[PDB]
């Protein structure tokens, strides 16, 4: 009986080591491991015969639905096409933005002006909107 338990503990110890070298030593993008709320820093403390982990996590709430587009383009020049970086392009519902479209973060509802910092140039696609007036990235 003792030999069996010792082997299971050794395997469990390997799992703990992996979590120290993943869940604790770094933020992780994997989901799965760590507490289920994306991942943000986790901590570990001593427990009898083992380690006790605590995981801080992020829980989304109050979801709303919005209109969004796959990307935007220049209607005057089809090779000028953009798509958001780490976020989305949505129709604006905010009174401070004169532009019909706005950038948002993907973790939270937070519309903002579209600027070169939050977008990248991409190959053209048939689903991108054709913008015939005011786009600052590219200005032309």
């Amino acid at each position, epitope marked *: 009986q003792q030999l069996v338990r010792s082997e299971s503990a050794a395997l469990s110890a390997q799992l703990a080591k992996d979590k120290v070298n993943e869940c604790v030593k770094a933020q992780s993008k994997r989901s799965g491991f760590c507490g289920q709320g994306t991942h943000i820093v986790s901590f570990v403390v001593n427990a009898p015969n083992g380690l006790y982990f605590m995981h801080v996590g992020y829980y989304p709430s109050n979801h709303i639905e919005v209109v969004s587009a796959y990307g935007l383009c220049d209607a005057a020049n089809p090779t000028n096409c953009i798509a958001p970086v780490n976020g989305y392009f949505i129709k604006t519902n905010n*009174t401070r933005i004169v532009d019909e479209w706005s950038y948002t973060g993907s973790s939270f509802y937070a519309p903002e002006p579209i600027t070169s910092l939050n977008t990248k140039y991409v190959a053209p696609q048939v689903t991108y909107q054709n913008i015939s007036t005011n786009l600052p990235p590219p200005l032309l």
Partner: antibody
Amino acid sequence: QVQLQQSGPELVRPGVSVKISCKGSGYTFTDYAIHWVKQSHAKSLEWIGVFSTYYGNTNYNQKFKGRATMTVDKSSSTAYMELARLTSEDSAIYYCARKSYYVDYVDAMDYWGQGTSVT
Amino acid sequence: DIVLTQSPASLAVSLGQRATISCRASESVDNYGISFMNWFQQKPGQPPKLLISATSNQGSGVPARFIGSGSGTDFSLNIHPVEEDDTAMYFCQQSKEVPRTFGGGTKLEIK
């Protein structure tokens, strides 16, 4: 208790620029965009342009893109518009208006200024 | 922009009479079914004001007496109880695209 306080009327000479302003009241001024409208006749009105008061971003009616500009003075909670090269055909009742969303994704003109005029 | 027209150019009615306004667009104003149609009102000595929006026939300016209707290129405004203080100019507004132009309007007055 929202109000827009338009500046008083003036008989500006042709060939001279003219400036018009509205002071916001009863709300935080920086959370909205100002819309400007021209009333060329009692039977007709047209949009002039829009100015964000938070970012300073603008759009204009194409006919006024080389004729006018807009500025803000957030410490005074006011906004301005100025138009170059006035002519007698531009006499109008001018109105400021505040952006709103009574319906999702639909701009509404919401509150209106009492009207001012230039001739 | 999309051209807007309205009819009848003016209407005169008896007190408490039903009345309507027809408004046509040269091209549909729906984008993703949003519609973007706003109706406005004006009287002499005052600025024009919002009445209704295409998904709000009460509030957003006035009471449920002013019912907006239609989709695509056709819109209308229906008031079952027209009264003397409803004497006004009325205007269709397009919020769908810049320049954000709007119709020449119609006039309503009690006979």
